[PDB]
Design a protein around this nucleic acid. Structure first.
Lengths: 128, 66, 131, 102, 214, 50, 63, 148
RNA sequence: CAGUCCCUCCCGCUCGGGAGGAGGCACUCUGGGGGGACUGCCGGCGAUAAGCCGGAGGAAGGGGCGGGCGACGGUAGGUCAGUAUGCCCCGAAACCCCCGGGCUACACGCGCGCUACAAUGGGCGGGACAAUGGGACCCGACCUCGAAAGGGGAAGGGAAUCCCCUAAACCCGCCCUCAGUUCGGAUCGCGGGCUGCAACUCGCCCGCGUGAAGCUGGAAUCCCUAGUACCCGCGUGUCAUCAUCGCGC
């Protein structure tokens, strides 16, 4: 199964199949990614899914764009969607919603343009 | 800490010299005047059912003069 | 040795040797590092163990840095005015060199000469509100 | 096998779609395999300028944008098909570049 | 990286940050119960639009809110004892990863110094550092006068967490000592109602003055 | 002697083709126009406000 | 800034007066009927007319 | 197993300690006196920093295939403070990486495609993936989940 | 290595790991259209109206988000030192051309941006990373030499084809140990690099001894309110260089 994930600019493309449990981020293992907090975020949906499905399927996800936090959140979205589509289970979806409302929805937030009068520090920045 | 908790049961309306204070009707739940309903002033956003904590049961607020 | 004298100035042993030579007016951070590496000794060791043979090694690297493997661009005044040979000036040597340059600039009546005479900036800095 | 790569570019979207439809109808009426019109990244030329004509006044600026759009048509080689792209009625603003690729 | 991977795998059984699940932790005063979010979540970070929600901030986890206070505390109109507090050098502003790591060390320190669940001690500090009455100005016939006024619970949380963060800045600034150790001291001193803590002392100041302005 | 010297660089080399001032000449893909003159020809160039 | 504009309040009354039976309480249905009956090109005003006629049809049977 | 299955830090450390033995790779006589980058403020601290550079640069040739000098300079560049003016991003030195690439090219680990870059020879790939699978064995023992 | 027979490379525990070609069009993507989303409904409020509040459902909801679009007059505001131009004035000048300087000059007052006022820390090494746009005497990849700014050669590129290309923020393996100093570089002099007829008035950078003030600043004080404040950087306009600026990402 192919699944999509969008957060700000980062884009996560995930492919889930049967396998030993080999989950790879851009081809790298999830356990070695140096940011520990990003590791937490990536591992949350498969933490909450269960060891059984963790070991039953193999998911390969490629993330591109944004920052590492955006990549990790998009990856989290991708694992969540891939797991729910592969299982097709309502109870997992409802637990995911209870944990947070974005696991199947996402964040529709995007950056605002930088308006004039000292646009450098942000959109709503003006002179003194 | 000889403080008396109580429950916000009605809000009369926003008050105070800047609209920040809210005049709330609060019912005492624990203390000497158990169950007394008093109009009390609250700083910080308030709702119905909030556990206020009070230092003095004697204190009341003047009727708002609109 | 808490107090160590090298090249006519005093240094403390607590700080590491590269940091210890930094108290020499005429040695910096990079300069101390590269001379102590020319010496073959880590500049990181504390300056309380500075033995005399290593002290005179550092001294004779100050005397003639170019012959010790140091390239010619790491000295303060390469291609010295009155010789044409790159050298590293130490203490009163720097002070006299800058004094000579000040008097020389005043003599030729260069713009920099008058700026130095008035205690004025040289490199085009604007005096309307700063300073 | 040989293909002709036809790059069409214009400012008004309607003219570009008109020429694309004419090329598609010609290719299908001539019975030639044609790769459909691929809409390439529109180039966005953005220019900012201060609206104050003088040094007096609050600093107000205006941004104007050209959206110049482009499409790619990869068709197979056919002389009878290539004879009917020089006769097409092209609107002035539409620019067409027809190259050949092995 | 083995400590990193150990803290990566331990919360596999849904544990806040790394360890110290939220089940053993309770709430003492009855007012903070519907406003502290103690729900079990791996990371205290939602990126949520709770500001847009007039009261949706109650759903954010307590440690997340504490970091939300900690990361915006530098450079302001307050000069406590004539000092200017500001993060000149790698400000925590926008660096919530730095705040994450620092308060991570803070949890570790409270573990190794008290040996209990850190969330329980945080509950203790917030419960004991909340002022309960303040002063308000009311004018009638032009006659400004001061009045004692009760505080809402949610503002009590806001002010308590702000005292925690402002204390962390206060001690960590201009000292060889480092931010985490300071945050640990402010929390532990408030949790035992130590008046030396700025949080409890200023809770006392706000409760007083209002005590006398009746 | 009445000739102006040949300059490829600097403001004195660049002049607006419409007004003739020596100041603000935007050269985005070769326009050669002053910045304010640019407004009096904005809608003839195809440009549109957004 | 909810308020339905005046010319919408004007259009809807005629629309439901001519074809009352055509419209029901369903928003998508009345929206498609507004689309086919009127010449609005702005999707937003089409859907606003749809919403107002939805509410209007709802009040038709309440009294 | 490959470099892609193992952390970068540990793998570069392993390649550095392993390549420290080889005689063809050596810091030049001007290496201990010239800092690794223009943007750098002080001199390097450890004396192994040369081999690390090699241990990293070959890894780069393992990933990007053809590599040249300028792109390496941009990657190794960093942020330097400009006093009263703000911090700015600058490129690193070129001669150090050029010498490292030449030493590796004489080492047979990397080769030159003129007009496209420096690519990695099959022998270099074998050595790198051998270290990587060594580390993957070790971390599989440390972390059983890497078996997956 | 979306699945990937066939071919190529390397490794392994022989499970498989990773990479390319073969060939495919799979997700985002680029863009020709349409839908969805609309006080749509529940309840209350409100005259039952308008419209409001709370609720659920929905990716998104009661001016969806930011703007373009600011009428009638007033301020006798600024702009004839740009364009059209009332009026007056000079006409070898109140014309034109060439060059040295000035427009950068300081006991100083004021405004605005940039940075320095460390242990969050400075230094070595690894790694998760974009994006607005631009490029022809240009982007310039890339081979090679020189620390280096750069020189010789050099592929590709007039725009999803090549280059600018790296983002930056961050964390860690390690070092330093609360100091006007290992902060911070102004300030000098030296020697090299780019540009241009040439930069001392009048460019910056590269490295060297050198290290200012500044170690948290009174009355008073301006502005933002959710992808927003805070904070952090990239790029580009104008442009050889000059902006710590404006722009916009």
């Amino acid at each position: 199964i192919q699944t999509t994930g969008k957060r700000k600019t980062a884009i996560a493309r995930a492919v889930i199949r049967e396998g030993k449990g080999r989950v790879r981020i851009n081809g790298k293992p999830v356990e070695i990614i140096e940011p520990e907090i990003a590791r937490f975020t990536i591992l949350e949906p498969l933490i909450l899914a269960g060891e059984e499905i963790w070991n039953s399927v193999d998911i390969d996800v490629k993330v591109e764009g944004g920052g590492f936090m955006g990549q990790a959140e998009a990856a989290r979205m991708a694992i969540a969607r891939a797991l729910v589509e592969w299982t097709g289970d309502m109870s997992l979806k409802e637990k995911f919603m209870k944990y947070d409302r974005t696991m199947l929805v996402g964040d529709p937030r995007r950056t605002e343009p930088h308006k004039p009068n000292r646009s450098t520090k942000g959109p709503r920045a003006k002179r003194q | 800490d000889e403080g008396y908790p109580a429950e916000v049961i009605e809000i009369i309306g926003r008050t105070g010299t800047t609209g920040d204070v809210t005049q709330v009707k609060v019912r005492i739940l624990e203390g000497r005047d158990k169950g007394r309903v008093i109009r009390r002033n609250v700083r910080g956003p308030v709702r119905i059912g909030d556990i206020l904590i009070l230092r003095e049961t004697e204190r009341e607020a003047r009727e708002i003069k609109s | 040795r808490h107090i160590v004298r090298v090249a006519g100035v005093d240094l403390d042993g607590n700080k590491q040797l590269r940091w210890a030579l930094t108290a020499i007016k005429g040695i910096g951070i990079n300069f101390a590092t590269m001379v102590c590496r020319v010496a073959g000794l880590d500049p990181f060791m504390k300056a309380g163990y500075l033995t005399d043979e290593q002290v005179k090694k550092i001294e004779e690297i100050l005397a003639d840095p170019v012959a010790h493997g140091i390239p010619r661009w790491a000295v303060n005044r390469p291609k010295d005015y009155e010789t044409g040979r790159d050298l590293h000036l130490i203490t009163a040597k720097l002070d006299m060199a800058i004094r000579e340059d000040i008097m020389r600039l005043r003599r030729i009546r260069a713009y920099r000469g008058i700026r130095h005479e008035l205690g004025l900036p040289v490199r085009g800095q604007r005096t309307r509100s700063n300073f | 096998m040989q293909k002709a790569r036809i790059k069409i570019a214009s400012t008004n979207v309607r003219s570009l779609d008109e020429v694309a439809n004419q090329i598609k109808q010609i290719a299908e009426r001539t019975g030639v395999r044609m790769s459909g019109p691929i809409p390439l990244p529109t180039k966005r030329i953005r220019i900012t300028t201060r609206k104050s004509p003088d040094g007096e006044g609050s600093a107000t600026f205006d941004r104007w944008e050209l959206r110049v759009h482009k499409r790619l048509i990869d068709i197979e080689a056919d002389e009878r098909a290539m004879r009917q792209i020089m006769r097409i009625r092209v609107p002035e603003d539409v620019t067409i570049e027809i190259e050949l690729i092995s | 990286a083995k400590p990193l991977n150990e803290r990566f795998f331990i919360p596999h059984e849904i544990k806040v940050m790394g360890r110290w699940s939220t089940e053993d932790v309770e709430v003492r005063d009855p007012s903070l119960k519907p406003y502290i979010n103690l729900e079990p979540r791996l990371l205290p970070h939602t990126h949520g639009r709770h500001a847009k929600k007039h009261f949706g901030k109650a759903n954010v986890h307590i440690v997340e809110r504490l970091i939300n206070k900690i990361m915006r505390s530098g450079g302001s109109h307050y000069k406590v004892a004539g000092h200017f507090m500001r993060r000149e050098h790698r400000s925590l502003n926008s660096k919530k990863v730095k705040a994450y790591e620092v308060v991570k060390e803070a949890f570790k320190i409270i573990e190794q110094r008290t040996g209990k669940n850190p969330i329980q001690v945080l509950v203790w500090a917030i419960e004991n550092a909340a002022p309960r009455e303040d002063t308000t100005s009311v004018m009638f016939g032009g006659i400004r006068y001061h009045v004692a006024v009760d505080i809402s619970p949610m503002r009590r949380l806001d002010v308590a967490l702000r005292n925690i963060a402002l204390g962390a800045s206060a001690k960590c600034y201009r000292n060889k000592m480092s931010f985490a150790e300071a945050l640990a001291e402010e929390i532990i001193l408030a949790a035992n109602k130590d008046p030396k803590s700025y949080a409890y002392s200023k809770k006392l100041e706000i409760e007083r003055i209002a005590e006398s302005s009746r | 002697y009445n000739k102006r010297k040949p300059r490829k660089f600097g403001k004195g080399a660049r002049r607006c083709i419409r007004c003739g001032q020596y100041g603000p000449i935007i050269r985005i893909q070769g326009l050669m126009l002053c910045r304010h003159c640019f407004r009096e020809v904005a809608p003839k160039l195809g440009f549109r406000k957004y | 800034g909810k308020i339905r504009q005046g010319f919408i309040k004007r259009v809807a009354r005629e629309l439901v007066n001519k074809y009352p039976n055509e419209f029901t309480t369903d928003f998508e249905h009345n929206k498609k009927k507004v689309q086919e009956l009127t010449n609005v090109t702005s999707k937003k005003i089409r859907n606003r007319i749809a919403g107002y006629v939805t509410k209007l049809v709802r009040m038709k049977m309440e009294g | 197993a490959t470099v892609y299955d193992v952390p970068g830090d540990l793998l570069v450390e392993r390649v550095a300690q392993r390549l420290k033995e080889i005689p063809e790779i050596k810091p030049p006589e001007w290496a201990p006196f010239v800092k690794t980058g223009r943007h750098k403020e002080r001199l390097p601290e450890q004396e192994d920093w040369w081999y690390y550079r090699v241990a990293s640069i070959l890894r780069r040739v393992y990933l990007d295939g053809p590599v040249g000098i300028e792109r390496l300079r941009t990657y190794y560049g960093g942020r330097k403070n400009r006093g009263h003016a703000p911090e700015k991003f600058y490129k690193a030195g070129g001669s150090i990486i050029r010498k490292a690439l030449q030493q590796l090219e004489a080492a047979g680990f990397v080769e030159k495609v003129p007009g496209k870059g420096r690519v990695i020879t099959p022998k270099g790939r074998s050595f790198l993936d051998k270290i990587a699978t060594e580390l993957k064995k070790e971390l599989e023992e440390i972390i059983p989940e890497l078996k997956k």
